[PDB]
Design an enzyme around this catalytic site. Structure first.
Site, PDB file in Angstrom:
ATOM      1  N   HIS D  78       0.837  -1.190   0.000  1.00  0.00           N
ATOM      2  CA  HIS D  78       0.000   0.000   0.000  1.00  0.00           C
ATOM      3  C   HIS D  78       0.876   1.245   0.000  1.00  0.00           C
ATOM      4  O   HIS D  78       1.991   1.237   0.525  1.00  0.00           O
ATOM      5  CB  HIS D  78      -0.928  -0.004   1.211  1.00  0.00           C
ATOM      6  N   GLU D  80       0.845   4.080   1.530  1.00  0.00           N
ATOM      7  CA  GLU D  80       1.246   4.632   2.820  1.00  0.00           C
ATOM      8  C   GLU D  80       2.413   3.861   3.418  1.00  0.00           C
ATOM      9  O   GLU D  80       3.340   4.455   3.980  1.00  0.00           O
ATOM     10  CB  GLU D  80       0.058   4.618   3.781  1.00  0.00           C
ATOM     11  N   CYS D 131      -6.977   2.881   4.277  1.00  0.00           N
ATOM     12  CA  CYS D 131      -7.937   1.801   4.419  1.00  0.00           C
ATOM     13  C   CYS D 131      -8.135   1.458   5.892  1.00  0.00           C
ATOM     14  O   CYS D 131      -7.216   1.533   6.708  1.00  0.00           O
ATOM     15  CB  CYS D 131      -7.480   0.569   3.640  1.00  0.00           C
ATOM     16  N   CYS D 192      -4.125   0.175   7.004  1.00  0.00           N
ATOM     17  CA  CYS D 192      -3.263   1.350   7.030  1.00  0.00           C
ATOM     18  C   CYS D 192      -3.658   2.315   8.138  1.00  0.00           C
ATOM     19  O   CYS D 192      -2.799   3.019   8.677  1.00  0.00           O
ATOM     20  CB  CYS D 192      -3.291   2.049   5.674  1.00  0.00           C
TER      21      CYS D 192
HETATM   22 ZN   LIG Z   1      -4.234   1.399   2.780  1.00  0.00          ZN
END
Ligand SMILES: [Zn+2]
Ligand SMILES: O=P(O)(O)O[C@H]1[C@@H](OP(=O)(O)O)[C@@H](OP(=O)(O)O)[C@@H](OP(=O)(O)O)[C@@H](OP(=O)(O)O)[C@H]1OP(=O)(O)O
Ligand SMILES: O=P(O)(O)O[C@H]1[C@@H](OP(=O)(O)O)[C@@H](OP(=O)(O)O)[C@@H](OP(=O)(O)O)[C@@H](OP(=O)(O)O)[C@H]1OP(=O)(O)O
Ligand SMILES: [Zn+2]
Lengths: 476, 152, 151, 373
Positions: D78, D80, D131, D192
């Site tokens: 991801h 991040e 997320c 995240c």
């Molecule tokens: Zn995420």
């Protein structure tokens, strides 16, 4: 009622909700997946309705007209379950193997499934259990007969542990296959007691020994859990990874995999109260149990009072490339061990099946099932055990569950041994317990102690023994 | 493929369906033996009078049905054995020093298993009235000290 | 706002001139208000270090250097035994916890359920509250169980 | 492109510069075009001077069957997370720069470990809401009764799928196993939103880099979607503000910012880092770098951000600075070697469990048992 009672019987006994049961049985009956036809009915004042009609076997299974899709579709699923239980028939498998190659283990693979589907004919409730399945065959001079057959990939929950030995602790397929083999061996000891010519045993120097040529072969439709599974990665690894990828592992009640221990980690013994308070019970992985089987024999401690150690001659796994790491996990980890005297490290033959890599089936919808069947030739009938509590759940006359111990449990094994001892006029102490009976086998106890000590001293790990109160119950 | 080898193969496949669980390999023809070669370590051909037909499904049930007079002695002796400790009737009721230590002990990185086990142990040995009156006190203390845990 | 437009255009042109680097115009209230950074991050330090000490390929150029140019740092990176335990307890529902707290036939269950419920209550309990609960339980046990645990 | 000034445009400036840097990279390597659907970046700020130091794209993770035991695969790709990993590599480079040029580095010898020079701060920007908790669920109903508490519980990423699932299920109570995950059990990776909470609690430097440096915290988190500042603040700061970590750590109160400006599921992901200076593209399905030769073959290389590469960089740092490290140590023990960080992480996970936020889904130990040499 508009729905036959057999629909409810199938829903209750199969352990599946009507929607999931309909989804499963439609796929097993035809080549499609249920699709709901969202018809609507309009009142003069204006309304919206759904019927969720499904078509199967050429019969109109139109459900009740209701307000929303949910109730209409579940009613249609109930009626479709009525339909699937009507037109009595079910899925079967024809043999599709190849010949002239190393197909002996493939012969064992087909005959295991073929035997299982024969049992499904008499007991329809075990359908779908064969995703994870193991069996034991007896071979002599090219004649093979299946001896034990079992399914399951889950263990006893820590909440349901008992001190009286009525619950099956590990319901993995190979473990239950070994237990069925134990029941068969008890039956053969009894047969030798009554008809020596017809038995597989003969009087040895100090105990019963197998007649020459008689062999036992284990087949598992998937790799046993533990380091036999963790080595799927074909990359050999570097240096310390070789010793790391050979240490002992233990199971969780429901985990599909195993957890590695440590160097004097988990050295503290498990306690009965600890598991009851919430501690997760640790059961040695099936790979380590098979290593123990090929070091100490499959007969166990109790049968060692009558018979000499019995070992698996071959172990077959329905995987295309398993020969190296299965052999390592099952034999090579203890190949340098020297058991006391009656025992030896069995150089078990490792076999590979063909046609199908079965783990596709073992990984799909096999995680959902919570019950395991077991069949053995000595009993001649199938038995279904709920793995969460490890005991048999039958249905009462007026409903609700009545729960009874499985024939493979510790209590039933001890009762069978005591019955044999009574019949064959064998003298046993009255107040012995299950632990004391197993400790009575001096040679087996010494060999087991030496094996555990050697596993410790060779850094392989700590054998996760159960609390002693698992086996303090008195048999008589 | 030779006709004999194909016949043996078809016989094996048909025997899969006709008598599931029973395998009968054929050795009177070396061509037939090539259809399903046993591993060389597993072959072990031996002359014997025993046959696989001596195994009957449910033999254990029938065997237990016979009276004990037809069963002869195996010639063995069975004697119990050194089970460690008596850790008296379960190392359950553990010695009173252990429960005294566990209740006194503060570092419970053990995840409170030992402390709860000690609580259960002291609860069991008390009489019905004493154990009855303790449990309401414990429940009330839990409810009053940590209402968010239990009263949520 | 003539100079506000100047600062706004300078900041807008900066995305195309030197992408990835921003230089806000301080020390001028009208131009500073063009991009007012929030007061939570408005710390101004007279440090001599500047952004120009950073350039692409920083790590690669440092690695390809003589080993004699690097001075000493903190010492003795000693290993530590990783915690072997998985999540050790099993979780149970709070509703189930309350159910075993109120049942009184527990002597049939040999009092295992009550102790398990107490343990699970205490596991989700903070250290100070858990210590207080343990002390209270021990005190009420000693009060009501002499000659059994109390000596 | 262009946006109105005179407002709180600092975070919009961050967004514009992140996109400008990405498009500058896309000019040098056109294969990365279209990856900016989910992008994140980390900025270094001193006084009024800003500089981008890490950048990444991607919104998927490692597949369960592609896991490895030697730490050569990226577990979470991801945007991040990979931005934080690029920041980790940048911090490694800065530690080495201090070891040779103390004036030229961002670090300065503190009381017991390296600390950032005064005024130096790090700022995280994300294209969309992280997320998990920070991202609003289009399903169900607004948080009420017990579901109000579920609006703050931990969420797990699930491989071979999208979105984050809630904890507390019957399957998630059991620990993750390597063999189980690889043969088909769903591998649980923390969302995240919870990973940003961990970053705000224990810092972004991680366990290995915590040997040399004091904890480093994001000073602000900016997300390019509005009317969600409070929800983002709750996910990354508020639901752990009461937690009291050990002495060197603290819960950072990050400044949540919204940019003025308010679909695709491409398999690959990219990451850029100032320390390296060159872009890297990894295949998110297996978390490895895929190249080609003679217009064919499938030559596969571990990513610069993988655990093995981080450990190798760490060992190189220790070698150059003459820091003594045990020779038979493994990755799992190296991370556990930092006493303060390990204690803080254990305390944080325990606190999350006790206050009923969920169980942190740790990876199987076999993920990190590989040795470093
Ligand atoms: Zn995420
Ligand atoms: O067949 P399994 O389910 O693997 O059971 C075995 C078996 O127990 P049974 O007595 O139920 O057959 C062993 O006994 P042996 O016959 O090999 O002596 C052994 O028991 P002991 O070592 O205690 O004698 C061991 O138990 P443990 O877990 O203590 O190693 C283990 O039982 P589990 O299923 O409980 O693992
Ligand atoms: O970059 P991330 O994907 O967030 O990786 C982290 C990181 O692991 P690595 O830096 O080793 O990749 C963490 O470690 P710390 O640096 O914070 O110590 C932590 O691992 P630990 O818990 O062992 O510290 C955690 O892993 P876990 O999921 O086990 O908590 C997690 O890894 P993943 O996000 O890849 O799972
Ligand atoms: Zn197993």
């Amino acid at each position: 009622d508009n729905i036959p009672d057999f629909v409810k019987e199938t829903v209750e006994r199969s352990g599946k909700n009507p929607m999931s049961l309909f989804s499963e049985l439609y796929v097993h009956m035809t080549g499609n997946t249920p699709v709901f036809d969202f018809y609507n009915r309009n009142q003069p004042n204006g309304s919206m309705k759904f019927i969720c009609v499904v078509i199967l076997n050429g019969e109109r299974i139109e459900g009740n007209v209701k307000s929303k899709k949910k109730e209409a579709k579940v009613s249609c699923s109930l009626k479709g379950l009525e339909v699937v239980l009507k037109h009595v028939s079910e899925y079967v498998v024809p043999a599709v193997k190849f010949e002239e190659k190393t197909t002996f283990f493939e012969m064992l693979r087909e005959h295991t499934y073929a035997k299982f589907y024969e049992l499904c004919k008499n007991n329809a409730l075990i359908y779908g259990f064969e995703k994870v399945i193991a069996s034991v065959f007896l071979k002599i001079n090219g004649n093979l007969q299946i001896i034990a057959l079992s399914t399951g990939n889950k263990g006893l929950r820590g909440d349901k542990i008992v001190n009286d030995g009525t619950a099956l602790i590990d319901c993995h397929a190979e473990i239950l296959a070994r237990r069925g083999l134990l029941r068969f061996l008890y039956s053969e000891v009894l047969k030798f007691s009554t008809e020596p010519p017809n038995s597989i045993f003969t009087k040895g120097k100090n105990a019963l020994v197998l007649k020459p040529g008689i062999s036992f072969h284990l087949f598992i439709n998937t790799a046993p859990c533990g380091v036999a599974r963790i080595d799927k990665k074909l990359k050999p690894g570097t240096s310390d990874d070789l010793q790391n990828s050979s240490r002992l592992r233990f199971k969780i009640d429901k985990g599909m995999g195993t957890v590695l221990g440590g160097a004097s980690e988990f050295e503290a013994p498990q306690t009965f109260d600890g598991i009851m308070m919430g501690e997760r019970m640790r059961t040695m992985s099936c790979s380590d149990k098979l290593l123990r089987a090929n070091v100490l024999g499959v007969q166990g401690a109790i049968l060692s009072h009558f018979i000499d150690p019995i070992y698996y001659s071959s172990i077959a796994v329905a995987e295309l490339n398993n020969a190296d790491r299965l052999r390592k996990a099952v034999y090579s980890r203890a190949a340098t061990f020297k058991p006391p005297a009656p025992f030896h490290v069995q150089d078990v033959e490792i076999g590979e099946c063909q046609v199908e890599d079965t783990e596709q089936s073992t990984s799909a919808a096999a995680r959902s099932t919570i019950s395991s069947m077991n069949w053995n030739l000595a009993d001649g009938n199938t038995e279904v055990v709920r793995t969460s509590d490890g005991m048999v759940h039958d249905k009462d006359m007026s409903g609700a569950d009545i729960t009874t111990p499985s024939r493979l449990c510790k209590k039933n094994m001890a009762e069978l041994m005591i019955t044999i001892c009574t019949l064959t006029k064998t003298s046993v102490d009255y107040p012995i317990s299950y632990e004391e009976l197993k400790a009575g086998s001096q040679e087996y106890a010494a060999a087991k102690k030496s094996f555990i000590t050697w596993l410790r001293q060779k850094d392989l790990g700590i054998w996760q023994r159960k609390p002693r109160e698992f086996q303090m119950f008195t048999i008589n | 493929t030779d006709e004999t080898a194909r016949k043996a193969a078809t016989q094996l496949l048909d025997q899969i369906q006709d008598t599931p669980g029973r395998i009968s390999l054929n050795f009177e023809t070396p061509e037939a033996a090539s259809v399903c070669p046993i591993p060389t370590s597993l072959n072990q051909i031996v002359n014997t009078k025993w046959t696989v037909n001596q195994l009957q499904e449910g033999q254990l049930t029938m065997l237990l049905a016979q009276d004990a007079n037809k069963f002869k002695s195996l010639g063995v002796k069975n004697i119990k054995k050194g089970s460690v400790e008596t850790q008296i009737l379960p190392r359950q009721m553990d010695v009173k020093e252990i429960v005294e230590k566990l209740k006194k002990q503060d570092n419970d990185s053990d995840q409170f298993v030992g402390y709860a086990a000690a609580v259960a142990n002291v609860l069991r040995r008390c009489d019905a009235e004493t154990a009855q009156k303790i449990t309401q006190a414990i429940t009330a203390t839990i409810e009053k000290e940590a209402p968010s845990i239990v009263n949520c």
